[PDB]
Amino acid sequence: YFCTYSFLYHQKDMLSDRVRMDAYFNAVFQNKHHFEGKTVLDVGTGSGILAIWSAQAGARKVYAVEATKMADHARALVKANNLDHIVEVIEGSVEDISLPEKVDVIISEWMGYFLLRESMFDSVISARDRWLKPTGVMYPSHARMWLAPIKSNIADRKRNDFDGAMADWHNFSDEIKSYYGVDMGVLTKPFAEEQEKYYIQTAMWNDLNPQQIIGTPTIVKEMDCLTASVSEIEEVRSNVTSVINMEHTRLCGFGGWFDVQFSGRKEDPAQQEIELTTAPSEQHCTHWGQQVFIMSNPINVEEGDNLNLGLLMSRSKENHRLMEIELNCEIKEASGNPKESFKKTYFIE
Amino acid sequence: QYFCTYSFLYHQKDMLSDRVRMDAYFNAVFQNKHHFEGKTVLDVGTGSGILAIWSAQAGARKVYAVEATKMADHARALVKANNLDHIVEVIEGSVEDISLPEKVDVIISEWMGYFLLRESMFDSVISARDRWLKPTGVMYPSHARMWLAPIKSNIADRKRNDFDGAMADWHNFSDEIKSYYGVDMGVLTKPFAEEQEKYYIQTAMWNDLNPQQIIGTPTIVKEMDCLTASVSEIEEVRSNVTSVINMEHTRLCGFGGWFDVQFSGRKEDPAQQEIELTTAPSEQHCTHWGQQVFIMSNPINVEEGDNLNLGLLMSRSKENHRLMEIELNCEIKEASGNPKESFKKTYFIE
Numbered sequence: 001y002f003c004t005y006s007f008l009y010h011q012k013d014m015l016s017d018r019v020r021m022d023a024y025f026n027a028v029f030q031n032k033h034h035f036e037g038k039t040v041l042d043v044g045t046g047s048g049i050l051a052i053w054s055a056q057a058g059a060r061k062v063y064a065v066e067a068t069k070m071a072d073h074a075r076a077l078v079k080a081n082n083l084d085h086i087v088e089v090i091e092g093s094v095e096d097i098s099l100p101e102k103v104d105v106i107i108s109e110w111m112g113y114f115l116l117r118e119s120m121f122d123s124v125i126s127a128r129d130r131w132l133k134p135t136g137v138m139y140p141s142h143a144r145m146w147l148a149p150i151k152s153n154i155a156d157r158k159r160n161d162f163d164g165a166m167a168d169w170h171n172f173s174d175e176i177k178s179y180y181g182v183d184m185g186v187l188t189k190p191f192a193e194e195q196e197k198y199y200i201q202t203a204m205w206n207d208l209n210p211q212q213i214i215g216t217p218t219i220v221k222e223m224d225c226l227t228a229s230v231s232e233i234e235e236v237r238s239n240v241t242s243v244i245n246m247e248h249t250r251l252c253g254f255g256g257w258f259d260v261q262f263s264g265r266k267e268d269p270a271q272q273e274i275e276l277t278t279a280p281s282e283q284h285c286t287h288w289g290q291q292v293f294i295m296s297n298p299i300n301v302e303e304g305d306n307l308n309l310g311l312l313m314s315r316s317k318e319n320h321r322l323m324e325i326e327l328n329c330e331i332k333e334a335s336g337n338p339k340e341s342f343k344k345t346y347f348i349e
Numbered sequence: 350q351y352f353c354t355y356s357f358l359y360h361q362k363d364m365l366s367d368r369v370r371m372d373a374y375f376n377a378v379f380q381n382k383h384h385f386e387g388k389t390v391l392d393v394g395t396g397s398g399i400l401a402i403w404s405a406q407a408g409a410r411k412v413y414a415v416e417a418t419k420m421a422d423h424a425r426a427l428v429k430a431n432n433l434d435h436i437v438e439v440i441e442g443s444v445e446d447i448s449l450p451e452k453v454d455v456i457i458s459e460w461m462g463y464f465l466l467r468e469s470m471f472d473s474v475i476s477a478r479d480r481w482l483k484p485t486g487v488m489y490p491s492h493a494r495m496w497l498a499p500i501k502s503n504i505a506d507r508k509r510n511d512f513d514g515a516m517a518d519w520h521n522f523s524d525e526i527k528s529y530y531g532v533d534m535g536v537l538t539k540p541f542a543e544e545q546e547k548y549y550i551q552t553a554m555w556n557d558l559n560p561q562q563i564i565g566t567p568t569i570v571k572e573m574d575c576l577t578a579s580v581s582e583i584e585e586v587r588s589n590v591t592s593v594i595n596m597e598h599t600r601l602c603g604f605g606g607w608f609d610v611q612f613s614g615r616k617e618d619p620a621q622q623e624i625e626l627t628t629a630p631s632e633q634h635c636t637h638w639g640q641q642v643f644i645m646s647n648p649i650n651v652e653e654g655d656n657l658n659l660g661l662l663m664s665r666s667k668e669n670h671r672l673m674e675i676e677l678n679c680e681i682k683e684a685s686g687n688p689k690e691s692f693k694k695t696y697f698i699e
């Protein structure tokens with residue numbers, strides 16, 4: 001994990017996100033009252049970009065914490081820009097560090113694929129509960145996860161890739177039975193499962209299109225970063241989305257994304273609320289795109305149809321930074337109430 | 350990190366799909382069933398259990414198939430389904446933490462990574478030999494061998510056109526970060542650069558070389574006797590010399606490394622027939638290891654009789670012990686000694 005974040009090359013990818021960058025930019029400077037002459041802790045500074053803007057905008061002192069050797073660059077960068085007298089870049093895992101003082105603002109960019117991937121917010125919680133004074137602000141102040149039924153040609157690409165996978169495995173076992181004389185038949189099933197788990201069962205990074213969304217989007221979890229806790233991170237949700245097309249569409253899968261907001265405390269508000277969304281757009285991509293969850297079996301669907309969804313979202317056992325999505329779906333026609341029930345496990349890795 | 354990959358049938362599959370590698374091992378066994386007829390066999394890192402199966406097919410008394418990964422499950426089912434469970438015993442664990450109901454006649458295993466030495470799976474085979482093999486014991490393969498040879502390849506252009514791309518993209522990036530956001534990224538121009546050279550240039554590429562692309566005499570850098578090879582023998586120094594052949598006129602663009610493996614058994618129990626598995630430049634024979642290429646930072650002209658005096662030093666990286674580093678020091682001397690043109694570059698295998 002920490003591995004990939006130690007590359008300049010990876011770090012600039014993020015910095016290249018104009019959408020990602022504009023939001024934090026405008027959140028800081030359009031609200032330089034949370035910063036003027038205050039103390040900020042930038043959580044997971046990496047390049048130290050967010051930690052520079054805070055100083056640039058009035059922060060008396062800014063603790064920029066980075067777990068990787070990337071810290072050594074955030075230093076040259078904060079020093080090369082003449083803010084070394086404000087920003088203190090400390091290398092090390094925020095979980096293991098002690099500060100001299102409590103902090104007014106915690107600023108971080110902890111959001112992953114589908115928001116919860118990487119579980120870096122667990123570090124921010126630690127930082128907030130250990131340091132944020134009783135009256136501190138947080139950037140972002142709230143977050144939000146969304147889901148919606150979509151219609152993509154990728155559903156078929158991946159079924160066509162699994163089918164091929166399966167076509168090859170059967171030539172190969174024929175080959176190995178002719179020469180060598182070993183019969184590979186009984187590993188057909190395990191090679192099946194391992195393959196549905198990879199082309200079908202595992203969420204795809206896609207760049208959805210507003211026109212690909214075929215129902216009302218649902219909010220699958222709201223969040224308050226001033227108050228959220230790790231215990232509430234593994235999450236269960238039930239809601240409903242309605243078809244709006246002719247429909248003359250099929251259910252090919254579900255897309256998931258997230259909202260983020262810079263609003264302030266209900267009591268130290270933002271002069272101006274800034275929103276970073278990843279909702280599909282014809283123009284604004286993010287490096288997060290959306291997570292497409294592909295349909296093992298596409299389904300016909302008409303307008304007015306009513307998709308009752310039951311999501312359950314737990315962090316994996318092998319690796320707590322990966323997700324596993326349990327998705328139960330009872331579809332109901334406009335008229336109550338036929339159905340097309342089914343249950344599917346998707347993996348965010 | 351390492352083992353993770355081998356728990357994948359799809360991967361185990363790639364290797365089993367490698368005809369050259371299979372033909373070699375399959376023949377090694379059946380052309381020599383005299384080591385296997387009624388013998389006890391240890392297979393180290395069984396995977397699908399393919400070597401265990403053949404051994405048992407060749408009349409072994411009992412076979413021992415050790416896999417670290419949950420793949421042991423499938424070798425175990427793969428051996429039941431071929432009516433060999435009464436001879437083959439698939440065990441789950443590391444050959445380092447496992448004990449045996451007895452000593453073993455033959456130790457067969459496919460432990461060779463990229464450029465022979467990657468993954469360092471031989472450490473496990475050794476351990477397996479030292480504790481379990483009996484004096485009489487034979488080993489498959491019985492010898493190994495790493496080679497090196499100066500080459501001519503358009504990939505040394507491909508990568509530097511790649512690097513330049515990278516650099517160009519950065520200088521725009523930084524200019525775009527200053528225009529909006531008001532940060533100058535200048536102090537990171539050099540570090541960015543080194544990362545990009547470390548990654549495009551100094552890092553070994555997989556390649557499938559044509560024998561024509563070999564512009565000098567090859568050279569043996571290391572030769573291995575699996576019966577006696579130590580783990581300390583595994584960090585390696587090698588000073589060779591090579592002579593440019595094509596050399597009417599070509600360009601030095603980098604180096605290729607590859608390995609040989611041999612199944613000759615023992616001098617007091619020799620193979621009825623010796624089998625070989627080579628990864629040299631082929632024209633008609635491919636392998637999943639291919640050849641490892643080490644690019645020239647800067648390509649150099651070269652002629653007939655030009656003498657490449659190479660100083661090599663193979664060692665493992667501090668971070669991971671399964672990865673390699675190669676300090677390659679090069680003195681080039683024209684057929685008329687000298688004058689020179691000497692360089693020094695450390696290459697990473699990952």
Ligand SMILES: Nc1ncnc2c1ncn2[C@@H]1O[C@H](CSCC[C@H](N)C(=O)O)[C@@H](O)[C@H]1O
Pocket residue numbers: 002005014015043044045046047048049050065066067068070092093094095108109110120123
């Ligand atoms: N517990 C922890 N302590 C310190 N740094 C952490 C951390 N968990 C994640 N990080 C770091 O936080 C960074 C998140 S990526 C964000 C980069 C930068 N803040 C920006 O917005 O441009 C990574 O560089 C990662 O190394």
Ligand SMILES: Nc1ncnc2c1ncn2[C@@H]1O[C@H](CSCC[C@H](N)C(=O)O)[C@@H](O)[C@H]1O
Pocket residue numbers: 352355356364365393394395396397398399400415416417418420442443444445458459460470473
């Ligand atoms: N110390 C160890 N103990 C058990 N298995 C090991 C091991 N080190 C490596 N392996 C396993 O050995 C295999 C190496 S690839 C060999 C696959 C198979 N024997 C064949 O020849 O086709 C991998 O499955 C790896 O997981």
